[PDB]
Amino acid sequence: DKRELVFKEEGQEYGQVQRMLGNGRLDAYCFDGQKRLCHIRGKMRKKVWVNPGDIVLVSLRDFQDSKGDIILKYTPDEARALKSKGEIPETTKI
């Protein structure tokens, strides 16, 4: 069946991809109100497309809050599940 829906934990935030920057980076608007310039991991890049509007789980960096690391990308269905469960705002464009 379907993979378990991963929720954010301490030191992580949900985000929505704003734009791709290349050199394996993207700008994400995170739902704690912070824009973060995020590293995309090689393994992820190979298996999935990451595009503007995608919902992502972001690992924070203690010393650089303007930066982060993409742990995972949510599928559209998973993103709607997050919304239905109140994890991201109801008005988020999926």
Coordinates of all heavy atoms in Angstrom, one line a residue, unseen atoms left out:
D1 N 0.8 -1.3 0.0 CA 0.0 0.0 0.0 C 0.8 1.3 0.0 O 2.0 1.3 -0.3 CB -1.1 0.0 1.1 CG -0.7 -0.8 2.3 OD1 0.2 -0.4 3.1 OD2 -1.3 -1.9 2.5
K2 N 0.2 2.4 0.3 CA 0.8 3.8 0.2 C 1.8 4.0 1.3 O 1.6 3.5 2.5 CB -0.3 4.8 0.2 CG -0.9 5.0 1.6 CD -2.2 5.8 1.5 CE -2.7 6.0 2.9 NZ -4.1 6.4 3.0
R3 N 2.9 4.7 1.0 CA 3.9 5.0 2.1 C 3.3 5.9 3.2 O 2.4 6.6 2.9 CB 5.2 5.7 1.4 CG 5.0 7.1 0.8 CD 6.3 7.7 0.3 NE 6.2 9.1 0.3 CZ 7.0 9.9 -0.6 NH1 7.8 9.3 -1.4 NH2 6.9 11.2 -0.5
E4 N 3.9 5.7 4.4 CA 3.4 6.5 5.5 C 3.6 8.0 5.3 O 4.7 8.3 4.7 CB 4.1 6.0 6.8
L5 N 2.7 8.8 5.6 CA 2.8 10.3 5.5 C 3.8 10.8 6.6 O 3.5 10.6 7.8 CB 1.5 10.9 5.6 CG 1.4 12.5 5.5 CD1 1.9 12.9 4.1 CD2 0.0 13.0 5.7
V6 N 4.9 11.4 6.1 CA 5.9 11.9 7.1 C 5.5 13.4 7.5 O 5.4 14.3 6.7 CB 7.3 11.9 6.4 CG1 8.3 12.7 7.2 CG2 7.7 10.4 6.2
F7 N 5.4 13.5 8.8 CA 5.1 14.9 9.4 C 6.4 15.5 9.8 O 7.4 14.8 10.0 CB 4.2 14.7 10.6 CG 2.9 14.1 10.2 CD1 2.7 12.7 10.4 CD2 1.8 14.9 9.7 CE1 1.5 12.1 10.0 CE2 0.6 14.3 9.4 CZ 0.4 12.9 9.6
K8 N 6.4 16.8 9.9 CA 7.6 17.5 10.3 C 7.9 17.2 11.8 O 7.0 16.9 12.6 CB 7.5 19.1 10.2 CG 6.5 19.8 11.0 CD 6.7 21.3 10.7 CE 5.6 22.2 11.3 NZ 5.6 22.2 12.8
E9 N 9.2 17.2 12.2 CA 9.6 17.0 13.5 C 10.5 18.2 13.9 O 10.6 19.1 13.1 CB 10.4 15.7 13.7 CG 9.5 14.5 13.5 CD 10.3 13.3 13.2 OE1 11.5 13.4 13.0 OE2 9.7 12.2 13.2
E10 N 11.1 18.2 15.1 CA 11.9 19.4 15.6 C 13.0 19.7 14.6 O 13.6 18.8 14.0 CB 12.4 19.1 17.0 CG 13.0 20.3 17.6
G11 N 13.2 21.0 14.3 CA 14.2 21.4 13.4 C 13.9 21.3 11.9 O 14.8 21.3 11.1
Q12 N 12.6 21.0 11.6 CA 12.2 20.9 10.2 C 10.9 21.7 10.0 O 10.2 22.0 11.0 CB 11.9 19.4 9.9 CG 12.9 18.4 10.2 CD 12.5 17.0 10.1 OE1 11.3 16.7 10.2 NE2 13.4 16.0 10.0
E13 N 10.6 22.2 8.8 CA 9.5 23.0 8.5 C 8.9 22.5 7.2 O 9.7 22.0 6.3 CB 9.9 24.5 8.4 CG 10.3 25.2 9.7 CD 9.2 25.3 10.7 OE1 8.0 25.2 10.4 OE2 9.6 25.5 11.9
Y14 N 7.6 22.7 6.9 CA 7.1 22.5 5.6 C 7.4 23.7 4.7 O 7.6 24.8 5.3 CB 5.6 22.3 5.6 CG 5.1 21.1 6.5 CD1 4.4 21.4 7.6 CD2 5.5 19.8 6.1 CE1 4.0 20.3 8.4 CE2 5.1 18.7 6.9 CZ 4.3 19.0 8.0 OH 3.9 18.0 8.9
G15 N 7.6 23.5 3.4 CA 7.8 24.6 2.6 C 7.2 24.3 1.2 O 6.9 23.2 0.9
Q16 N 7.1 25.4 0.4 CA 6.6 25.3 -0.9 C 7.7 26.0 -1.9 O 8.2 27.1 -1.6 CB 5.3 26.1 -1.1 CG 4.7 25.9 -2.5 CD 3.2 26.2 -2.5 OE1 2.7 27.1 -1.8 NE2 2.5 25.5 -3.4
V17 N 8.1 25.2 -2.9 CA 9.2 25.6 -3.8 C 8.7 26.8 -4.6 O 7.7 26.8 -5.2 CB 9.6 24.4 -4.7 CG1 10.6 24.9 -5.7 CG2 10.1 23.3 -3.9
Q18 N 9.6 27.9 -4.5 CA 9.3 29.1 -5.3 C 10.0 29.1 -6.6 O 9.4 29.4 -7.7 CB 9.7 30.4 -4.5 CG 9.0 30.5 -3.1 CD 7.5 30.5 -3.3 OE1 7.0 31.4 -3.9 NE2 6.8 29.5 -2.6
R19 N 11.3 28.7 -6.7 CA 12.0 28.7 -7.9 C 13.2 27.8 -7.8 O 13.7 27.6 -6.7 CB 12.4 30.1 -8.4 CG 13.3 30.8 -7.5 CD 13.3 32.4 -7.7 NE 12.0 33.0 -7.5 CZ 11.4 33.2 -6.3 NH1 12.1 33.0 -5.2 NH2 10.2 33.8 -6.2
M20 N 13.6 27.2 -8.9 CA 14.9 26.5 -9.0 C 16.0 27.4 -9.2 O 15.9 28.3 -10.1 CB 14.8 25.4 -10.1 CG 13.6 24.6 -10.1 SD 13.3 23.8 -8.3 CE 14.7 22.5 -8.3
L21 N 17.2 27.2 -8.6 CA 18.3 28.1 -8.8 C 19.5 27.5 -9.5 O 20.4 28.2 -9.9 CB 18.7 28.8 -7.4 CG 17.7 29.6 -6.7 CD1 18.2 30.0 -5.3 CD2 17.3 30.9 -7.4
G22 N 19.4 26.2 -9.6 CA 20.6 25.4 -10.2 C 21.7 25.3 -9.2 O 21.6 25.9 -8.1
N23 N 22.8 24.6 -9.6 CA 23.8 24.2 -8.6 C 23.2 23.5 -7.5 O 23.6 23.6 -6.3 CB 24.6 25.5 -8.2
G24 N 22.1 22.7 -7.8 CA 21.3 22.0 -6.9 C 20.7 22.7 -5.7 O 20.7 22.3 -4.6
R25 N 20.2 24.0 -6.0 CA 19.5 24.7 -5.0 C 18.1 25.2 -5.4 O 17.8 25.3 -6.6 CB 20.4 26.0 -4.5 CG 21.6 25.7 -3.8 CD 22.3 27.0 -3.3 NE 23.6 26.8 -2.8 CZ 24.7 26.8 -3.5 NH1 24.7 26.9 -4.8 NH2 25.9 26.6 -2.9
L26 N 17.3 25.5 -4.4 CA 16.0 26.1 -4.7 C 15.7 27.1 -3.6 O 16.2 27.0 -2.5 CB 14.9 25.1 -4.9 CG 14.6 24.2 -3.6 CD1 13.8 24.9 -2.5 CD2 13.9 22.9 -4.1
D27 N 14.8 28.1 -3.9 CA 14.2 29.0 -2.9 C 12.9 28.4 -2.5 O 12.1 28.0 -3.4 CB 13.8 30.3 -3.6 CG 15.0 31.2 -3.8 OD1 16.0 31.1 -3.0 OD2 15.0 32.0 -4.8
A28 N 12.7 28.2 -1.2 CA 11.4 27.7 -0.7 C 10.8 28.7 0.3 O 11.5 29.4 1.1 CB 11.6 26.4 0.1
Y29 N 9.5 29.0 0.2 CA 8.8 29.7 1.3 C 8.4 28.7 2.3 O 7.6 27.8 2.0 CB 7.6 30.5 0.7 CG 6.8 31.0 1.8 CD1 7.2 32.2 2.5 CD2 5.6 30.4 2.3 CE1 6.5 32.7 3.6 CE2 4.9 30.8 3.4 CZ 5.3 32.0 4.0 OH 4.6 32.5 5.1
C30 N 8.9 28.8 3.6 CA 8.6 27.8 4.6 C 7.4 28.4 5.4 O 7.3 29.6 5.6 CB 9.8 27.5 5.5 SG 11.2 27.0 4.5
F31 N 6.6 27.5 5.9 CA 5.4 27.9 6.6 C 5.5 28.4 8.0 O 4.5 28.7 8.7 CB 4.3 26.8 6.5 CG 3.8 26.7 5.1 CD1 4.2 25.6 4.3 CD2 2.9 27.6 4.5 CE1 3.8 25.5 2.9 CE2 2.5 27.5 3.2 CZ 3.0 26.5 2.4
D32 N 6.8 28.6 8.5 CA 7.1 29.4 9.7 C 7.4 30.9 9.3 O 7.8 31.7 10.1 CB 8.3 28.8 10.5 CG 9.6 28.8 9.7 OD1 9.6 28.8 8.5 OD2 10.7 28.9 10.3
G33 N 7.1 31.2 8.0 CA 7.2 32.5 7.5 C 8.6 32.9 7.0 O 8.8 34.1 6.7
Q34 N 9.5 31.9 6.8 CA 10.9 32.2 6.4 C 11.1 31.7 5.0 O 10.8 30.5 4.8 CB 11.8 31.6 7.5 CG 13.3 31.6 7.2 CD 13.8 33.0 7.3 OE1 13.3 33.8 8.2 NE2 14.8 33.4 6.5
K35 N 11.7 32.5 4.2 CA 12.3 32.1 2.9 C 13.6 31.4 3.2 O 14.5 31.9 3.9 CB 12.5 33.2 2.0 CG 11.1 33.9 1.6 CD 11.4 35.1 0.7
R36 N 13.9 30.2 2.6 CA 15.1 29.6 2.8 C 15.7 29.1 1.5 O 14.9 28.6 0.6 CB 15.0 28.4 3.8 CG 14.7 28.9 5.2 CD 14.8 27.7 6.2 NE 14.6 28.2 7.5 CZ 13.4 28.4 8.1 NH1 12.2 28.1 7.5 NH2 13.3 28.9 9.4
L37 N 17.0 29.3 1.3 CA 17.7 28.8 0.1 C 18.2 27.4 0.5 O 19.1 27.3 1.4 CB 18.9 29.8 -0.1 CG 19.4 30.2 -1.5 CD1 20.8 30.8 -1.5 CD2 19.3 29.0 -2.5
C38 N 17.7 26.4 -0.2 CA 17.8 25.0 0.2 C 18.7 24.2 -0.8 O 18.5 24.2 -2.0 CB 16.4 24.4 0.4 SG 15.4 25.2 1.6
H39 N 19.6 23.4 -0.2 CA 20.3 22.4 -0.9 C 19.4 21.2 -1.3 O 18.7 20.7 -0.4 CB 21.5 21.9 -0.1 CG 22.2 20.7 -0.7 ND1 23.0 20.8 -1.9 CD2 22.3 19.4 -0.3 CE1 23.5 19.6 -2.2 NE2 23.1 18.8 -1.2
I40 N 19.5 20.8 -2.5 CA 18.8 19.5 -3.0 C 19.8 18.4 -3.1 O 20.8 18.5 -3.8 CB 18.1 19.7 -4.4 CG1 17.3 21.1 -4.4 CG2 17.2 18.5 -4.6 CD1 16.9 21.5 -5.8
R41 N 19.5 17.3 -2.5 CA 20.4 16.1 -2.4 C 20.4 15.3 -3.7 O 19.4 15.2 -4.4 CB 20.1 15.2 -1.2 CG 20.2 16.0 0.1 CD 19.7 15.2 1.2 NE 19.9 15.9 2.5 CZ 19.5 15.6 3.7 NH1 18.6 14.5 3.7 NH2 19.8 16.2 4.7
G42 N 21.6 14.8 -4.1 CA 21.8 14.1 -5.4 C 20.8 13.0 -5.6 O 20.3 12.8 -6.7
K43 N 20.6 12.2 -4.6 CA 19.7 11.0 -4.6 C 18.3 11.4 -5.0 O 17.6 10.8 -5.8 CB 19.7 10.2 -3.3 CG 18.8 9.0 -3.3 CD 18.4 8.7 -1.9
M44 N 17.8 12.5 -4.4 CA 16.5 13.0 -4.7 C 16.3 13.5 -6.1 O 15.4 13.1 -6.8 CB 16.1 14.1 -3.8 CG 14.8 14.8 -4.2 SD 14.1 15.9 -2.7 CE 14.2 14.6 -1.3
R45 N 17.3 14.3 -6.6 CA 17.3 14.9 -7.9 C 17.2 13.8 -9.0 O 16.5 13.9 -10.0 CB 18.6 15.6 -8.2 CG 18.8 16.9 -7.4 CD 20.2 17.5 -7.5 NE 20.5 18.0 -8.8
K46 N 17.9 12.6 -8.8 CA 17.9 11.5 -9.7 C 16.5 10.8 -9.8 O 16.1 10.4 -10.8 CB 19.0 10.5 -9.3 CG 20.4 11.0 -9.6
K47 N 15.8 10.7 -8.6 CA 14.5 10.0 -8.6 C 13.3 10.8 -8.9 O 12.3 10.2 -9.4 CB 14.4 9.1 -7.4 CG 14.2 9.9 -6.1 CD 13.3 9.1 -5.1 CE 13.2 9.9 -3.7 NZ 13.0 11.4 -3.9
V48 N 13.3 12.1 -8.6 CA 12.0 12.8 -8.7 C 12.3 14.2 -9.3 O 13.4 14.7 -9.3 CB 11.3 13.0 -7.3 CG1 11.0 11.7 -6.7 CG2 12.2 13.8 -6.4
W49 N 11.2 14.8 -9.9 CA 11.3 16.2 -10.4 C 10.9 17.0 -9.2 O 10.0 16.7 -8.5 CB 10.4 16.4 -11.5 CG 10.8 15.8 -12.8 CD1 10.3 14.7 -13.4 CD2 11.9 16.2 -13.6 NE1 11.0 14.4 -14.5 CE2 12.0 15.3 -14.7 CE3 12.9 17.2 -13.5 CZ2 13.0 15.3 -15.7 CZ3 13.8 17.3 -14.5 CH2 13.9 16.4 -15.6
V50 N 11.7 18.1 -9.0 CA 11.3 19.1 -8.0 C 11.1 20.4 -8.7 O 12.0 20.9 -9.5 CB 12.4 19.3 -6.9 CG1 11.9 20.3 -5.9 CG2 12.7 18.0 -6.2
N51 N 9.9 21.0 -8.6 CA 9.5 22.1 -9.4 C 8.8 23.2 -8.5 O 8.3 22.9 -7.4 CB 8.4 21.7 -10.4 CG 9.1 21.0 -11.5 OD1 9.9 21.5 -12.3 ND2 8.6 19.7 -11.7
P52 N 8.8 24.4 -9.0 CA 8.0 25.5 -8.3 C 6.5 25.0 -8.0 O 5.9 24.3 -8.9 CB 8.0 26.6 -9.3 CG 9.3 26.4 -10.1 CD 9.4 25.0 -10.3
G53 N 6.1 25.3 -6.8 CA 4.8 24.9 -6.3 C 4.8 23.6 -5.5 O 3.9 23.3 -4.7
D54 N 5.9 22.7 -5.7 CA 5.9 21.5 -4.9 C 6.0 21.7 -3.4 O 6.6 22.7 -3.0 CB 7.1 20.6 -5.4 CG 6.9 20.0 -6.8 OD1 5.7 20.0 -7.2 OD2 7.9 19.6 -7.4
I55 N 5.4 20.8 -2.6 CA 5.6 20.9 -1.2 C 6.7 20.0 -0.7 O 6.8 18.8 -1.2 CB 4.3 20.5 -0.4 CG1 3.1 21.3 -1.0 CG2 4.4 20.7 1.1 CD1 3.3 22.8 -1.0
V56 N 7.5 20.5 0.1 CA 8.8 19.9 0.5 C 8.9 19.9 2.1 O 8.3 20.8 2.7 CB 10.0 20.5 -0.1 CG1 10.1 20.1 -1.7 CG2 10.1 22.0 0.1
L57 N 9.6 19.0 2.6 CA 10.0 19.0 4.0 C 11.5 19.5 4.1 O 12.4 18.9 3.4 CB 10.0 17.6 4.6 CG 10.2 17.5 6.2 CD1 9.2 18.4 7.0 CD2 10.2 16.1 6.6
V58 N 11.7 20.5 4.9 CA 13.0 21.3 4.9 C 13.6 21.1 6.3 O 13.0 21.3 7.3 CB 12.7 22.8 4.8 CG1 14.1 23.6 4.8 CG2 12.0 23.1 3.4
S59 N 14.9 20.6 6.3 CA 15.7 20.6 7.5 C 16.4 21.9 7.7 O 17.1 22.4 6.9 CB 16.7 19.5 7.4 OG 17.4 19.4 8.7
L60 N 16.2 22.5 8.9 CA 16.8 23.8 9.2 C 18.3 23.7 9.5 O 18.8 22.6 9.8 CB 16.1 24.5 10.4 CG 14.5 24.7 10.3 CD1 14.1 25.6 11.5 CD2 14.2 25.3 9.0
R61 N 19.0 24.8 9.4 CA 20.4 24.9 9.8 C 20.5 25.9 11.0 O 20.2 27.1 10.8 CB 21.2 25.4 8.6 CG 21.3 24.4 7.5 CD 22.1 24.9 6.4 NE 22.1 24.0 5.2 CZ 22.8 24.2 4.1 NH1 23.5 25.3 3.9 NH2 22.7 23.3 3.1
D62 N 20.9 25.4 12.1 CA 21.0 26.2 13.3 C 21.8 27.5 13.2 O 21.4 28.5 13.8 CB 21.6 25.4 14.5 CG 20.5 24.5 15.2 OD1 19.4 25.0 15.3 OD2 20.8 23.4 15.5
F63 N 22.9 27.5 12.4 CA 23.7 28.8 12.3 C 23.3 29.6 11.1 O 23.7 30.8 11.0 CB 25.2 28.5 12.3 CG 25.6 27.4 13.2 CD1 26.4 26.3 12.8 CD2 25.2 27.5 14.6 CE1 26.8 25.3 13.7 CE2 25.6 26.5 15.5 CZ 26.4 25.4 15.0
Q64 N 22.6 29.1 10.1 CA 22.1 29.9 9.0 C 20.6 29.7 8.7 O 20.3 28.9 7.8 CB 23.1 29.8 7.7 CG 23.7 28.4 7.5 CD 24.7 28.4 6.2 OE1 25.2 27.3 5.8 NE2 25.0 29.6 5.7
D65 N 19.8 30.5 9.3 CA 18.3 30.4 9.2 C 17.8 30.7 7.8 O 16.7 30.3 7.4 CB 17.6 31.3 10.2 CG 16.1 30.8 10.4 OD1 15.8 29.6 10.7 OD2 15.2 31.7 10.1
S66 N 18.6 31.5 7.0 CA 18.2 31.8 5.6 C 18.4 30.6 4.7 O 18.2 30.7 3.5 CB 19.0 33.0 5.1 OG 20.4 32.6 5.0
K67 N 19.0 29.5 5.3 CA 19.3 28.3 4.5 C 18.7 27.0 5.0 O 18.2 26.9 6.1 CB 20.9 28.1 4.3 CG 21.5 29.2 3.3 CD 23.0 29.1 3.1 CE 23.6 30.4 2.8 NZ 23.1 31.1 1.6
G68 N 18.7 25.9 4.2 CA 18.1 24.7 4.6 C 18.5 23.6 3.7 O 19.3 23.8 2.8
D69 N 18.0 22.4 4.0 CA 18.2 21.2 3.2 C 16.9 20.5 2.9 O 16.1 20.3 3.9 CB 19.2 20.2 4.0 CG 20.5 20.8 4.2 OD1 21.4 20.7 3.3 OD2 20.7 21.5 5.3
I70 N 16.7 20.1 1.7 CA 15.4 19.4 1.4 C 15.6 18.0 1.8 O 16.5 17.3 1.2 CB 15.1 19.5 -0.2 CG1 15.0 21.0 -0.6 CG2 13.8 18.8 -0.5 CD1 14.1 21.9 0.3
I71 N 14.7 17.5 2.7 CA 14.8 16.1 3.0 C 13.9 15.3 2.0 O 14.4 14.3 1.5 CB 14.3 15.8 4.4 CG1 15.0 16.6 5.5 CG2 14.4 14.3 4.7 CD1 14.1 16.7 6.8
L72 N 12.7 15.8 1.8 CA 11.8 15.0 1.0 C 10.8 15.9 0.2 O 10.6 17.1 0.6 CB 11.1 13.9 1.7 CG 10.1 14.2 2.9 CD1 8.7 14.2 2.4 CD2 10.3 13.0 3.9
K73 N 10.3 15.3 -0.8 CA 9.2 16.0 -1.6 C 7.9 15.3 -1.4 O 7.9 14.0 -1.5 CB 9.6 16.1 -3.1 CG 8.4 16.5 -4.0 CD 8.6 16.0 -5.4 CE 7.3 16.3 -6.2 NZ 7.6 15.8 -7.6
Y74 N 6.9 16.0 -1.1 CA 5.5 15.3 -1.0 C 4.9 15.1 -2.3 O 5.0 16.0 -3.2 CB 4.6 16.2 -0.1 CG 5.1 16.2 1.3 CD1 5.9 17.2 1.8 CD2 4.8 15.1 2.2 CE1 6.4 17.2 3.2 CE2 5.2 15.1 3.6 CZ 6.0 16.1 4.0 OH 6.5 16.1 5.3
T75 N 4.2 14.0 -2.5 CA 3.4 13.8 -3.7 C 2.2 14.7 -3.6 O 1.8 15.2 -2.5 CB 2.8 12.3 -3.9 OG1 1.9 12.1 -2.8 CG2 4.0 11.3 -3.9
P76 N 1.5 15.0 -4.8 CA 0.3 15.8 -4.7 C -0.7 15.3 -3.7 O -1.3 16.0 -2.9 CB -0.3 15.8 -6.1 CG 1.0 15.7 -6.9 CD 1.9 14.7 -6.2
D77 N -1.0 13.9 -3.7 CA -1.9 13.3 -2.8 C -1.4 13.5 -1.3 O -2.3 13.8 -0.5 CB -2.1 11.8 -3.1 CG -3.0 11.6 -4.3 OD1 -3.7 12.5 -4.7 OD2 -2.9 10.4 -4.8
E78 N -0.2 13.4 -1.1 CA 0.4 13.6 0.3 C 0.2 15.0 0.7 O -0.2 15.3 1.9 CB 1.8 13.2 0.3 CG 2.0 11.7 0.2 CD 3.5 11.3 0.2 OE1 4.4 12.1 -0.3 OE2 3.8 10.2 0.7
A79 N 0.5 16.0 -0.2 CA 0.3 17.4 0.1 C -1.1 17.7 0.4 O -1.4 18.4 1.4 CB 0.8 18.2 -1.1
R80 N -2.1 17.2 -0.3 CA -3.5 17.3 0.1 C -3.8 16.7 1.4 O -4.6 17.2 2.2 CB -4.5 16.9 -1.0 CG -4.3 17.6 -2.4 CD -5.2 16.8 -3.4 NE -4.6 17.2 -4.7 CZ -4.0 16.4 -5.6 NH1 -3.9 15.1 -5.3 NH2 -3.6 16.8 -6.7
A81 N -3.2 15.6 1.7 CA -3.4 14.9 3.0 C -2.9 15.8 4.1 O -3.6 16.1 5.2 CB -2.7 13.5 3.1
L82 N -1.7 16.4 3.9 CA -1.2 17.4 4.9 C -2.2 18.5 5.1 O -2.4 18.9 6.2 CB 0.2 18.0 4.4 CG 1.4 17.1 4.5 CD1 2.6 17.8 3.8 CD2 1.6 16.7 5.9
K83 N -2.8 19.0 4.0 CA -3.7 20.1 4.1 C -5.0 19.7 4.9 O -5.5 20.4 5.7 CB -4.1 20.7 2.7 CG -5.2 21.7 2.7 CD -5.7 22.0 1.3 CE -4.7 22.8 0.5 NZ -5.3 23.3 -0.7
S84 N -5.5 18.5 4.5 CA -6.7 18.0 5.1 C -6.5 17.8 6.6 O -7.4 18.1 7.4 CB -7.2 16.7 4.4 OG -8.2 16.1 5.2
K85 N -5.3 17.4 7.0 CA -4.9 17.2 8.4 C -4.5 18.5 9.1 O -4.1 18.4 10.3 CB -3.8 16.1 8.5 CG -4.3 14.7 8.0 CD -3.0 13.8 7.8 CE -3.4 12.5 7.2 NZ -4.1 11.7 8.2
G86 N -4.5 19.7 8.5 CA -4.2 20.9 9.1 C -2.7 21.3 9.3 O -2.4 22.3 10.0
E87 N -1.9 20.5 8.6 CA -0.4 20.7 8.7 C 0.1 21.8 7.9 O 1.1 22.5 8.3 CB 0.3 19.4 8.3 CG 0.2 18.2 9.3 CD 0.9 18.5 10.6 OE1 2.1 18.6 10.6 OE2 0.2 18.7 11.6
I88 N -0.6 22.1 6.8 CA -0.3 23.3 6.0 C -1.6 24.1 5.7 O -2.6 23.5 5.9 CB 0.5 22.9 4.7 CG1 -0.4 22.0 3.8 CG2 1.9 22.3 4.9 CD1 0.2 21.8 2.3
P89 N -1.5 25.4 5.3 CA -2.8 26.1 5.2 C -3.8 25.6 4.2 O -3.3 25.1 3.1 CB -2.3 27.5 4.9 CG -0.9 27.6 5.4 CD -0.3 26.2 5.1
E90 N -5.1 25.7 4.5 CA -6.1 25.3 3.5 C -6.0 25.9 2.1 O -6.4 25.3 1.1 CB -7.5 25.5 4.1 CG -8.4 24.2 4.0 CD -9.5 24.3 3.0 OE1 -10.6 24.7 3.5 OE2 -9.3 23.9 1.8
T91 N -5.5 27.2 2.1 CA -5.4 27.9 0.9 C -4.1 27.6 0.0 O -3.9 28.2 -1.0 CB -5.5 29.4 1.1 OG1 -4.5 29.8 2.1 CG2 -6.9 29.8 1.7
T92 N -3.3 26.7 0.5 CA -2.1 26.4 -0.2 C -2.4 25.8 -1.6 O -3.3 24.9 -1.6 CB -1.2 25.4 0.6 OG1 -1.0 25.9 1.9 CG2 0.1 25.1 -0.2
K93 N -1.8 26.3 -2.6 CA -2.0 25.9 -4.0 C -1.3 24.6 -4.2 O 0.0 24.7 -4.2 CB -1.5 26.9 -4.9 CG -1.9 26.6 -6.4 CD -1.8 27.9 -7.3 CE -0.4 28.6 -7.1 NZ -0.4 29.9 -7.8
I94 N -1.9 23.5 -4.4 CA -1.2 22.2 -4.7 C -1.0 22.0 -6.1 O -1.9 21.7 -6.9 CB -1.9 21.0 -4.0 CG1 -2.1 21.2 -2.5 CG2 -1.1 19.7 -4.2 CD1 -0.9 21.7 -1.8

